[PDB]
Every structure is written in C-alpha cells, then in structure tokens.
RNA sequence: GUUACGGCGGUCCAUAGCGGCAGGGAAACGCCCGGUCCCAUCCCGAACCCGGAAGCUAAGCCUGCCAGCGCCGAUGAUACUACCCAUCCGGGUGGAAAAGUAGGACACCGCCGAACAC
C-alpha cells in the first residue's frame, strides 16, 4: 500500500463567518477545519480544484500532507459538507494524524459482478466501518460475485481484507442480497 | 459461578425508608432557630442530629454508641430516653429551645416515641 | 419450646446434604423455603356470589386462617367481570404453620389422590418455584367432606430462595415432595 | 350542508406575569397556570387553580430543583 | 394472627392406622377438626386422629 | 394506487413549498435515481404512471424503488358552489417534494436502457428533474 | 489530621445511571434468632413493632477496575432569521441552531459523628 499523500497549500483564515466563507467559495477556495489530538483547532482555506483532484484520485478518505504557514502537517479527511443541487464542496473537516495510529474509517465497497442469467443483485449498503493504519486506508473493498446462484447473502464477515485491518461494523450485515430475479408480472405488484 | 436473582429485603427496606423520608421531608423545614430533629435508627443503636437545612449544616448530635450512654443498663427504650436527655441538654446549651421532629422515615411509637416524649418532658417545645 | 417435623428435619439433614452437593462458600446461600401460597378462582362470581363464601369456609377449615378476597381490578365484560367482583380467595402461609401444612399435605392428602403417579419436576419457573394445582377439595380430612355442594379446586405454589431449578428440585426432594424421579 | 364546527372558548390570560429580576410585593401573582409547569420554591405559595403567588417580598429567581423549573423569592437589601 | 378470629389452634396426633408409623405435632387443627383419644406421645397429652391412609401405606414414588 | 389506510386528521392545510431538502438527497437502494429541482406537489396517479412507464421500458427484470408516499391530502369541494360554508372533502393525496429530494431508484444493468426509462418517467411529472448515479 | 466507615444534605441533578470483574467487615451499616410486653396484617410477627446478639459478609452497602449498554458535548460550516441593498433572481452587516464530529465522563462538594493520633 504505497500511498502518495497528496500535498496542498493551505493558509490560515483572517475572518471566520458566513460572509467571509461565501466570498471564499466565490473566489474559488473552500474553507476547512483541522483538529484532532492537536487540540488547537485551525481554520484554513484550501483550493477547490486541487482538492477535487485529490478526492477524485484517491477516494474520499484520503490522507493529506498539508502546508500550513510554511510549516507542513499531516491530516486525514474525516467528513465532507456537500450541497445537494450544485454538488460543490462547502466545507471539510480534517483529522490530524501521526503515523502508526488506529483511527476508525468508513470506506466503500465495489461490486465486481457478472452473475448467472437468472440472477439479480441488490446492494443494501455502500459504507463499511473499518479500523486500519494511517497511511494504509483502502479506497475500494472489492467484492466479487461470479458463479454464484440465487440466494447467497454476502455477509459482511466474508470480505477479504489487507493484513492489519479490522472489521468493526457488525458481521450481521447484508452487504449484498442476490435476489431471485423478478417477473415482468412481479413488476406490476411492487408499490401499488 | 453461582449467581442470585433479585431484590433482598435489606435493599427493599432501605430504599423504602429513603422513599418515605424524602416524602415526609416536603413539609418539614430547617432554620437555626427552628432546626430539624433527625433520627437515624438501627436495631442495635440510634443516632440523632439537629439540622439546619438552609445550609445543610448541623448544630447538635447524639447517639447510643457513646460509652457514657451505654452506661445505661435498661432496655433499648431507656438508652433512647437518656439520649433524649443528652440532646435536650446539648441543644439548650448551643441555643435552641424550639424544634420540629422528623421521624426520619420510621414509624412513631416505641423507641422513637419514647425518646421524643422524654424530650418533651425535659423541656423541648414539640 | 417446640419444633415441627419438617423444620427440625430441615435444620438437621437437608442443609447438610445440599452443602455436600453444591459446595457453597457462605451458608447464607443455602436454599430455604420462605412461604406457601394458596389460591382459589371461583370464576362464577357473576353467577354464584355465594360459592365465594363457600370457598372461604373451606380454606378456613383447611389452613386455620381467614383468607383474603381478591378483587378484580380490571373489568373484562366477555366474562361478566366488573371492577370489584370477587373472583377468588388467597392465603399466605409462613413459619411453623407452613411447615405443619406441608407435613399434612405430604402425609395425608397427596397420599390420597387417585392414581397419583407423580407431580412433575416441570412446574418450576426461572429458579425453582413449584406451582401445581388441585381439581377438588375432596381430599383433606381437615374438610368436612360430607357437606360440600360442588367441586371447588385450588392452585398451590411454593416459593424458595433457590436460584435454579436443579437446586429447587433437589431441595424439594430432600423435603419429600413425590416428584416423578426421572 | 352545514359546518357543525365553529365554537371556541374565550381566553383565560395565562402565563408569566412577573419575570426575572422584578420587585414584587406580597400576595402578588407571579404566574397563572393550569398544572404545575412551574413549581414553588422558597417564600412562594400555590393556589387552588395552581396559580402561584408570593408569601414574602423580594425578587424573582426561576431556577430548577431536581429537573423542575421552580420560582423563588430572595431578600431585597434594606435601604 | 389477629382478632376477627381465625379457626382455633391445638396440637394433633395422626395415628398411623396403616402400619403404626404414627405422627404427632402442633397444628391449627383442633376443636375445628380433631378426633378423640388424647394419647400422650411425649411429655404432654393432646388429641388423636385415626389415619386411614398415609405415605408408608400408599404405594408411590416413596412407597411401593 | 397509493393511499394510506387511515390518517388521524383528514383535512390538512396545504404543505409548504419553501426550502431545500434535508433527507433523500442521496441515492439509497439502487444505482440510477431521479432528483428533483423545483417545488411541487406530486400525487398518486403521477407516480403510478411513472412506475408503469419504467416497467414497460425494462419489461423483464430490474427493480424500482419509490421513496415517496402520498400521505398529505388536499380538499376539493363540489362544483358551482359559492365560496364559504366549510371545507371540502379529501379527494386526492399528495406528497410534497422539495428540491434535492430523490423520488425513484432503479436497479437495471445497462445504463442505456436505465437512463432512457428514467427519462420516460420524468416526462410524466410536473417538475424539472435530473438523473443521478450513486457516485459522488 | 486520617483510612476501602456510617448519617444528614447540595448540584440550575445521569459528567452522577445500568450491566460485568475483583475485593472489605476492628467499632459502625447490616442481614439473622424468637414473638414474653407496646404495637400490626384488607389473611400471614412477610412488612411495620418489640425483645437479643448463635451465625455470615453470600446479598444490601462502601472501594478499584471495563467507556459496553445510556448520558454530556464544543470550534468551524450549514439551515433558518432581524435589518438593508436588489425590476422577479438573489445578495451584504449582525445573531445562530438541530444532527454530526473531536472528545469527556465509572462524579464533585459541605457538616456532624466514629475509629485513629500526635
């Protein structure tokens, strides 16, 4: 897991409020917050294009090697604040990180699926809770569904992991449900 | 790996006592010129206090543990009687004549009542 | 200055045997019967308000104490039942009177049931409280069994500080309830 | 072809009448209320209709006593 | 337990009429429900009750 | 048809058409969703028309979720009656739909057919809308 | 003054609760023995009450541990909003949530009494 923590120039904020924040978003930045066991909550402005490149590249949970005030820092993206319509990025929380730490994480699965003909898939869940190392978070829990038949409830305690990564969502979950496929006459009797 | 099931009557009796004592306490008040006479009973011995509930402070005290009160020979009731004597003397030294009587979550009669009646006899106004 | 049979027996043998069986640290953990309970649901309260008095008289003659008359706190009209209609009598038994009652029951009446094969070991609950039931009162020689005008059965239940069914059955065995030994 | 509704009941002028800080005489009415939304504390009394009133002059303090909003009266400083 | 009197309470001797393995003990069974023959089985004398049947005369788990 | 089996209060005010969505701004159970952009009241018959539009365009197998239910009535009153004299009776049932909100979610393999189906179901509704993938 | 003690109280009353683990009984808190005397059960000395100290810290209770069931909870952003600008849209100065997050927390404080001591 040879990750390249993306680098980003961030500058501390003068003004902290709604007017300033809208002016910032307008200019083309994104406000952001930094905290953790740093215990010194910093308020930053990132640049949205660079931030979006970083996310689109390495998934949403993606470590960062920031540059604050000339000094550099290490952070993880804990939470995003998105707009529904425009689908901008309004605000970003950032958890400081030392190397070798155990922080809980929530990543996305990937259904690589080609099934039997009489088969349909149903993704009951996207997001699974994990603890891992700092530099070693995945991007995609690949789950494969091929050769299988009708009902095969892929439990959560069935996915293949890295070495040194732990599942913390309960192993009861239906991540997938392989339904007996519908009839064209069954599609008349669903939601009427 | 033996394990119990539920409530013992010690717990029942205790929490019921606290229940009815803090029921009663709604009507009783405290003040340094009219304090509250709390009683706290056990099977063996007994304890009492004069309480000021304006500051949750205490002005007098007594109990049937002190050897000078164990120097009684007679019944539990007589221990209680001499206790009432001592607290009358002490209260009227520290400067309290009138009080109320909190039965502390116990029934009136027996040792409580004989205490209080000895105190009424020996001067306290209640 | 007196001792009932079952209680002397209890303090002599049974505590010892349960100690030698279950190996408690404190003897306070030893199981001990507390009380005995009796109930009679008349059920025809809305049709005979006089069988109630009959049952009261029977349990009086049987237990030597005036029962309690349990009222109906709820009103369920599918049975005619209304708030306060007396449906049943109930008696509590504690102490020497209890031990005497168990002596009599085990030694006179239960050896007078018709084709008594055995009381189940499965009338327990959670920890060992034995809740059985009698169809008729035609059995206690205590009763004047000439005057009875109807069957008026009852329901008995025996409660103990035992913590589980194994200790309960073992104790009641040592005390001499005719379980179905299985 | 009728609207069988239409009725209503005239008011009763409930609520707080002497808020925090004010000076109140004796027997004055702090709050009118149906239930004990606000309970009495010290130097305060209850009515028949669960009204509250003052028993001793002073000034108000809407504090809580074990989860329940109370009303109190404190001693003014004599001039 | 108390006034509003209960039935009366006196001892009893349940004389085993099966094989002579009798019983005798304090009870609430007396004027209420007792039999004649005040036979002292002990230091005192108190009523007796013929025992038509019992345990040691009733084949069951405790008896054959 | 979609209706509730019983409502407590069967004569309600008109819902509000002010504000943006708080929930249902994220595809949940399928792959290809519909998202609104305007404010509107969507009824029972519209949603029936739309689900039928989808099932007659996939026709075999592939699932359809409806994250809306008409649980707020509206009151017509009978015809040619002067205003006044009460409040009419409920006749059709709407769901309010604030912008950002998601209505439908499909699960069919090929995006071609799926996008086309959702478009046919969009043209059965009063709102401007758009199509969504579960991705960011 | 002080210890794994008891009792009465308080906190704008769960930061204090529930559950699990270990552990304590000197004087005290207790449980327990029995209904002679006051007194009591809508029946029962079970409870309340009385008379004592054979027995055990098993339980109650107190002490430490477990952040797991529950609770508390920010900064910053957002929603909403007062006022103003603005031909519909939208915007600026100020105020500012809920949720979420980081985290916290197996309470704190006061008085008398004991035991312990110079």
Curated annotation (Swiss-Prot), chain C:
Cellular component terms per the entry's GO annotation: ribonucleoprotein complex; ribosome
Indicate the transmembrane segments per the record. none
Q: Give one Pfam family, short name only.
A: Ribosomal_L5
User: GO terms for molecular function, please?
Assistant: rRNA binding; structural constituent of ribosome; tRNA binding
Give the source's domain of life in one word.
Bacteria
InterPro entries according to UniProt: Ribosomal_uL5 (IPR002132), Ribosomal_uL5_bac-type (IPR020930), Ribosomal_uL5_C (IPR031309), Ribosomal_uL5_dom_sf (IPR022803), Ribosomal_uL5_N (IPR031310)
| Protein keywords | Ribonucleoprotein, Ribosomal protein, RNA-binding, rRNA-binding, tRNA-binding
Is RNA-binding found in the keyword set? yes
State any GO BP term from the record: translation
User: Which SUPFAM superfamilies does the annotation name?
Assistant: RL5-like
How the protein assembles, per its UniProt entry? Part of the 50S ribosomal subunit; part of the 5S rRNA/L5/L18/L25 subcomplex. Contacts the 5S rRNA and the P site tRNA. Forms a bridge to the 30S subunit in the 70S ribosome.
Q: HAMAP family under this entry? A: Ribosomal_uL5_B
The family this protein is said to belong to = Belongs to the universal ribosomal protein uL5 family.
Q: Which PANTHER family match?
A: 60S RIBOSOMAL PROTEIN L11-RELATED
General function of this protein: This is one of the proteins that bind and probably mediate the attachment of the 5S RNA into the large ribosomal subunit, where it forms part of the central protuberance. In the 70S ribosome it contacts protein S13 of the 30S subunit (bridge B1b), connecting the 2 subunits; this bridge is implicated in subunit movement. Contacts the P site tRNA; the 5S rRNA and some of its associated proteins might help stabilize positioning of ribosome-bound tRNAs.
Q: What is this protein's name?
A: Large ribosomal subunit protein uL5
Identify the gene encoding this protein: rplE
Swiss-Prot record, chain D:
GO MF annotation, one: structural constituent of ribosome
Keyword tags: Ribonucleoprotein, Ribosomal protein
* Pfam families cross-referenced by the UniProt entry: Ribosomal_L27
Q: List all membrane-crossing ranges.
A: none
Report the InterPro entries cross-referenced here: Ribosomal_bL27 (IPR001684), Ribosomal_bL27_CS (IPR018261)
What residue range is the signal peptide? none
| Top-level taxon | Bacteria
Q: Can you say what this protein is called?
A: Large ribosomal subunit protein bL27
Q: Which GO terms describe its cellular component?
A: cytosolic large ribosomal subunit
Query: What is the similarity comment for this entry?
Result: Belongs to the bacterial ribosomal protein bL27 family.
Name any Gene Ontology BP term: translation
Specify whether Ribosomal protein is a keyword of the entry: yes
What gene is behind this protein?
rpmA
Swiss-Prot record, chain F:
Instruction: Give the start-end ranges of region Disordered.
Output: 1-24
> Does the keyword Oxidoreductase feature in the UniProt annotation?
no
Q: Output one GO MF annotation.
A: rRNA binding
Compositional bias (Basic residues): 1-13
Q: Which InterPro entries match?
A: Ribosomal_uL16 (IPR047873), Ribosomal_uL16_bact-type (IPR000114), Ribosomal_uL16_CS (IPR020798), Ribosomal_uL16_dom (IPR016180), Ribosomal_uL16_sf (IPR036920)
Question: Which GO CC annotations does the UniProt entry carry?
Answer: cytosolic large ribosomal subunit
| One example of a Gene Ontology biological process annotation | translation
* Keywords linked to the UniProt accession: Ribonucleoprotein, Ribosomal protein, RNA-binding, rRNA-binding, tRNA-binding
Q: Which family does it belong to?
A: Belongs to the universal ribosomal protein uL16 family.
Cite the record's note on assembly. Part of the 50S ribosomal subunit.
Question: NCBIfam families given for it?
Answer: rplP_bact (TIGR01164)
Function of the molecule: Binds 23S rRNA and is also seen to make contacts with the A and possibly P site tRNAs.
Q: What is this protein called?
A: Large ribosomal subunit protein uL16
Per the UniProt entry, what species is this protein from, by scientific name?
A: Mycolicibacterium smegmatis (strain ATCC 700084 / mc(2)155)
High-level lineage:
Bacteria, Bacillati, Actinomycetota, Actinomycetes, Mycobacteriales
Q: Which gene encodes it?
A: rplP
């Amino acid at each position: 897991t040879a990750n390249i923590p993306n680098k980003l120039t961030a500058n501390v904020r003068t003004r902290t409020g709604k007017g300033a924040s809208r002016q910032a978003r307008r200019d083309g930045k994104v406000p952001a917050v930094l905290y953790g066991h740093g215990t010194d909550p910093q308020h930053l402005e990132l640049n949205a294009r660079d931030f979006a490149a970083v996310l689109r590249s390495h998934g949403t949970n993606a470590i960062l090697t920031l540059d604050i005030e000339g000094t550099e820092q290490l952070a993880l993206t804990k939470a995003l604040d998105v707009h529904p319509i425009r689908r901008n990025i309004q605000h970003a929380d950032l958890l400081v990180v030392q190397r070798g730490e155990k922080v809980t994480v929530e990543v996305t699965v990937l259904v690589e699926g080609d099934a039997t003909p009489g088969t349909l898939v149903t993704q009951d869940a996207n997001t699974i809770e994990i603890e891992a190392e700092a530099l070693s978070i995945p991007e995609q829990l690949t789950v494969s569904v091929e050769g299988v038949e009708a009902g095969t409830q892929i439990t959560a305690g069935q996915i293949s992991l890295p070495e040194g990564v732990n599942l913390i969502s309960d192993p009861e979950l239906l991540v997938v449900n392989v339904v007996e496929a519908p009839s064209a006459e069954a599609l008349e009797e669903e939601g009427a | 790996a033996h394990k119990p099931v539920g409530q013992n009557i010690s717990e029942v009796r205790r929490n019921a006592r606290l229940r009815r004592h803090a029921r009663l306490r709604k009507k009783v008040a405290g003040t340094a010129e009219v304090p509250r006479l709390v009683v706290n009973r056990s099977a063996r011995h007994i304890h009492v206090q004069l309480v000021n509930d304006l500051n949750g402070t205490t002005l007098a005290a007594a109990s049937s543990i002190e050897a000078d009160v164990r120097a009684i020979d007679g019944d539990k009731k007589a221990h209680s009687v001499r206790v009432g004597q001592l607290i009358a003397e002490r209260a009227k030294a520290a400067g309290v004549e009138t009080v109320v009587f909190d039965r502390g979550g116990y029934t009136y009669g027996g040792r409580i009542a004989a205490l209080a009646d000895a105190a009424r006899e020996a001067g306290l106004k209640f | 200055k007196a001792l009932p049979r079952l209680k002397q027996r209890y303090r002599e043998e049974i505590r010892e045997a349960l100690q030698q069986e279950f190996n408690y640290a404190n003897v306070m953990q030893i199981p001990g019967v507390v009380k005995v309970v009796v109930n009679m649901g008349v059920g025809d309260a809305a049709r005979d308000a006089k069988l109630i008095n009959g049952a009261i008289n029977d349990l009086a003659l049987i237990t030597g104490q005036k029962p309690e008359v349990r009222r109906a706190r709820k009103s369920i009209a599918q049975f005619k039942l209304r708030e306060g209609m007396p449906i049943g009598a109930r008696v509590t038994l504690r102490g020497d009177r209890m031990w005497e009652f168990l002596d009599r029951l085990i030694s006179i009446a239960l050896p007078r049931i018709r084709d008594f094969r055995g009381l189940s070991p499965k009338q327990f609950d959670g920890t060992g409280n034995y809740t059985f039931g009698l169809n008729e009162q035609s059995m206690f020689h205590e009763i004047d069994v000439d005057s009875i005008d109807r069957p008026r059965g009852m329901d008995i239940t025996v409660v103990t500080t035992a913590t589980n069914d194994a200790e309960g059955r073992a104790l009641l065995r040592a005390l001499g309830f005719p379980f179905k030994e299985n | 072809s009728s609207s069988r509704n239409g009725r209503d009941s005239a008011a009763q002028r409930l609520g707080v009448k002497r808020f925090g800080g004010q000076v109140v005489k004796a027997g004055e009415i702090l709050v009118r209320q149906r239930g004990t939304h606000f309970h009495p504390g010290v130097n305060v009394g209850r009515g028949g209709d669960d009204t509250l009133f003052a028993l001793a002059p002073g000034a108000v303090e809407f504090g809580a006593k074990r989860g329940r909003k109370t009303v109190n009266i404190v001693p003014v400083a004599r001039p | 337990m108390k006034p509003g009197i209960h039935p009366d309470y006196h001892p009893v001797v349940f004389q085993d009429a099966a094989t002579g393995a009798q019983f005798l003990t304090r009870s609430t069974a007396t004027s209420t429900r007792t039999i004649e023959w005040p036979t002292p089985s002990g230091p005192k004398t108190y009523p007796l009750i013929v025992v038509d049947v019992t345990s040691d005369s009733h084949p069951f788990w405790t008896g054959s | 048809m979609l209706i509730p089996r019983k409502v407590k209060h069967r004569k309600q005010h008109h819902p509000e058409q002010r504000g943006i969505a708080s929930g249902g701004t994220s595809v949940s159970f399928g792959d290809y969703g519909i998202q609104a952009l305007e404010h509107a009241y969507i009824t029972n018959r519209q949603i029936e028309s739309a689900r039928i539009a989808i099932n007659r365009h996939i026709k075999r197998g592939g699932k359809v979720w409806i994250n809306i239910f008409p649980d707020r009535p509206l009151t017509k009153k009978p015809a040619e009656t002067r205003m006044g004299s009460g409040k009419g009776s409920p006749e059709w049932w709407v769901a309010n739909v604030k912008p950002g909100r998601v209505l439908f979610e499909l699960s069919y393999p090929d995006e071609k057919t799926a996008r086309d189906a959702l478009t046919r179901a969009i043209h059965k509704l009063p709102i401007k809308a758009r199509i969504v993938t579960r991705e960011e």
